[PDB]
Paper text:
We present here a structure-function analysis of one of the best-known HCMV immunevasins, UL16, and its interaction with a cellular ligand for NK cells, MICB. The normal function of MICB is to activate NK cells by engaging the most well-known NK receptor, NKG2D. HCMV-encoded glycoproteins UL16 and UL142 selectively prevent the surface expression of MICB, ULBP1 and ULBP2 (UL16) and MICA (UL142), respectively, through intracellular retention. UL16 is a heavily glycosylated 50 kDa type I transmembrane glycoprotein whose structure could not be predicted from its primary sequence.
In order to elucidate the structural basis for the ability of UL16 to engage highly diverse NKG2D ligands and to compare this promiscuous binding mode to that of NKG2D, we determined the structure of the UL16 ectodomain in complex with the α1α2-platform domain of MICB (MICBpf) at 1.8 Å resolution. In order to obtain soluble and homogeneously glycosylated protein for our structural and surface plasmon resonance (SPR) studies, we expressed the UL16 ectodomain in Chinese hamster ovary (CHO) Lec 3.2.8.1 cells. NK receptors binding to MHC class I or class I-like molecules belong to two structurally distinct families, the Ig superfamily and the C-type lectin superfamily. While NKG2D belongs to the latter group, our structural analysis shows that UL16 assumes an Ig-like fold. We find that UL16, which possesses no structural homology to NKG2D, nevertheless employs a NKG2D-like binding mode to interact with MICB. A set of five predominantly hydrophobic core residues on the UL16 surface precisely mimics a set of five equivalent residues in the central region of the interface used by the structurally unrelated immunoreceptor NKG2D to interact with its ligands. The “rigid adaptation” concept is furthermore supported by the finding that UL16 engages its ligands via a rigid β-sheet, which does not allow for much conformational flexibility. Our structure shows that substitution of Gln169 with arginine, which is present at this position in MICA, would lead to steric clashes with UL16 residues Met59 and Leu161 that would prevent binding. In the UL16-MICBpf complex, Ala162 faces towards Tyr125, a UL16 footprint residue. Taken together, these analyses suggest that some NKG2D ligands apparently bypass intracellular retention by UL16 through alteration of a small number of key residues at strategic locations of their potential UL16 binding interface. To the best of our knowledge, the structure presented here is the first structure of a viral immunoevasin in complex with a stimulatory NK receptor ligand as well as the first reported case of structural mimicry through convergent evolution of a human immunoreceptor by a viral immunoevasin.
Numbering used by the authors:
A (entry chain B): 27 to 163
B (entry chain A): 0 to 148, 152 to 175
The structure:
Amino acid sequence: VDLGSKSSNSTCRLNVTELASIHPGETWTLHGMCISICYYENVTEDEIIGVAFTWQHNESVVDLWLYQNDTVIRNFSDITTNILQDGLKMRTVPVTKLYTSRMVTNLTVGRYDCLRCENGTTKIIERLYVRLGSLYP
Amino acid sequence: MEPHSLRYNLMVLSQDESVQSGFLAEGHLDGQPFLRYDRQKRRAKPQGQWAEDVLGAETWDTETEDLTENGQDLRRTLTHIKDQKGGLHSLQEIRVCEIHEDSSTRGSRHFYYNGELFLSQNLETQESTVPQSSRAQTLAMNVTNFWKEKTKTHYRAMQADCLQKLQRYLKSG
Ligand SMILES: *[C@@H]1O[C@H](CO)[C@@H](O)[C@H](O)[C@H]1NC(C)=O
Ligand SMILES: *[C@@H]1O[C@H](CO)[C@@H](O)[C@H](O)[C@H]1NC(C)=O
Ligand SMILES: *[C@@H]1O[C@H](CO)[C@@H](O)[C@H](O)[C@H]1NC(C)=O
Ligand SMILES: *[C@@H]1O[C@H](CO)[C@@H](O)[C@H](O)[C@H]1NC(C)=O
Ligand SMILES: *[C@@H]1O[C@H](CO)[C@@H](O)[C@H](O)[C@H]1NC(C)=O
Ligand SMILES: *[C@@H]1O[C@H](CO)[C@@H](O)[C@H](O)[C@H]1NC(C)=O
């Protein structure tokens, strides 16, 4: 699967096996909550961006959803736990946000990597680890 | 045990057909003020010693951007409310999210025109409620029609924003 923008000559072939070793722009962990909100400036019409999900319990098991031209072009393979899995464009600044909100279960714990192609290489702009736990402190 | 909560209170004003520049805003966390908005500097700022010294300073960068987006949206909405009467008019939005002791969440927004509730929306279910009055119905039709011209995504994203912030603020304390 390809990410990035053909018009900007910045396309990258996704290799999920390489994601673990990529240094993310920002990285954090939530316990008992799965809400990832990734911030993309100056997204072009043809640019494919998205979110990879690597299961906590098997690093080889990776899901993906993809966004292009303000529409979801690929859902997670399992959407039953999804509360929100879509993008939106802000009005006051030229920013597109990708929202991934899911029920936290033994099947959604893991690593969520917000992806972008830059100069034909895969970047991770934000990485969120999700773990079980009590939302209420 | 009472739920944890994050509450935003924004207000915009109009007179003689012109929506004033800027907006008013405040935020409360678990019932206590933590956020104020400097309308001149156009900056969210801490309210109280706890918000000043405990919350990360990045809090105010994020809140400034988020309030600006919300406040400009509210200015736009007021522009499209039909009211040709003179005088100072106000549109206020109260937005709240909660985390309950059983770890479940709630979220809603409520709109007041000249102090009168005319529309409430449940941000988790997308259900809207309008008071039984001819005036409130007219106002709510006015607003909801303007919005019509990603609805579900829009409302759920507001809830996601709020919940993410609440979780972060609770951790800091
Ligand atoms: C994906 O990445 C791994 C690690 O670099 C590499 O061994 C493998 O050859 C790559 N797969 C493809 C199809 O390029
Ligand atoms: C996006 O594009 C605008 C207009 O060209 C430019 O001013 C701005 O710096 C760009 N944003 C970023 C963060 O690259
Ligand atoms: C993006 O979507 C719009 C429809 O909303 C369409 O008119 C436009 O051609 C699309 N752009 C591309 C490059 O697909
Ligand atoms: C992890 O996933 C890979 C790829 O599906 C599979 O080959 C492997 O058996 C799994 N390992 C475990 C311990 O579940
Ligand atoms: C993603 O899932 C939604 C809900 O089932 C569906 O409406 C939409 O067509 C799906 N999109 C794709 C590209 O599979
Ligand atoms: C996984 O979680 C579900 C609830 O989502 C629960 O019913 C099930 O027992 C769990 N299974 C394991 C092996 O943890």
